[PDB]
Design a protein around this ligand. Sequence first.
Ligand SMILES: Nc1nc2c(c(CN[C@H]3C=C[C@H](O)[C@@H]3O)cn2[C@@H]2O[C@H](COP(=O)(O)O)[C@@H](O)[C@H]2O)c(=O)[nH]1
Ligand SMILES: [N+]
Length: 321
Amino acid sequence: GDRLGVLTTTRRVVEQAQAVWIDHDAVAQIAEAFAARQVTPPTWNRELHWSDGREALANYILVLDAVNFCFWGEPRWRIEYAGAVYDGYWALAASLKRALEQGVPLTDASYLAEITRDDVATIFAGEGEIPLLDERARILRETGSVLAERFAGRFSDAIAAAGRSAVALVDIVTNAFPSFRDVATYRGEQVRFYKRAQILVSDLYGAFDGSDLGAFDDLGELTAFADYKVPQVLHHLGILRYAPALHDRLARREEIPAGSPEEVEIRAATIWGVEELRRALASRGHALDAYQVDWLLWDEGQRLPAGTLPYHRTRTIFYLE
Ligand SMILES: Nc1nc2c(c(CN[C@H]3C=C[C@H](O)[C@@H]3O)cn2[C@@H]2O[C@H](COP(=O)(O)O)[C@@H](O)[C@H]2O)c(=O)[nH]1
Ligand SMILES: [N+]
């Protein structure tokens, strides 16, 4: 069933986990409510996402998801675009569209391979500064050179080699692009997540409306994308519970080291939180794919009540690259 081993490896963490557990009573109740009013994920957002030709849109999706991480910090990083102030993901998406409309060639492997610290400090210019600026530059350079060297500057070539398999395409991405390699260990066992590689596949589906390069026959094989907003929504809905030390650490906005048992438990329990909710919805005759349940919860996250427990703060590491 699980050809990437996200569900298999995360399942071992959820079974042994000390600081996080699922409230299956709360899963049942949220499923009852969601299935009753037949909730849908939002439509892949056309306004803040770029669109273009086949070849350029494919490379744009790769660039977008290559740097799709870690937006928290003080002072909050914000962007002005089309007379609106944005933060977090929508800041990332706006900053890229803004740069593209002013004809910065971010879709071009040659430009990316070469891109300087100051080129990307400009693209993400606003209140404060995007976290891990230097790292995003390194990742975009890595993305360009791999595109240029292995795929003739066209992500379309990678996508064609996947033969409409979402799972095949994740594996091709992690194999070729080092910075998409999202694995950890728990009590000496490897745990596999592949957040940005899996987001990338769902974003192609969204961008191309499940046609051409966005066509995939096995989207059901995707899991949830183990980020920091979705577990915040599952804690808010009562589905994820946190033990005392972790509850206090999140409340005080203390940072959690990447790959620490607490961070890996939050992420593994996010994967199974979304999975057990998908099962319970299906049981109640509302059959969604795990990525759709993710999109739907991520959307809830964009309008949580002020004074819900803060999201966990992990500074994303690329030590090995
Ligand atoms: N699990 C999951 N995580 C997601 C997304 C998205 C954007 N996807 C779009 C495509 C289809 C959907 O309907 C969305 O419109 C961003 N993130 C993560 O969020 C965090 C920033 O959060 P804030 O500060 O609140 O913007 C950061 O870790 C980023 O990686 C998602 O879909 N699922
Ligand atoms: N969110």
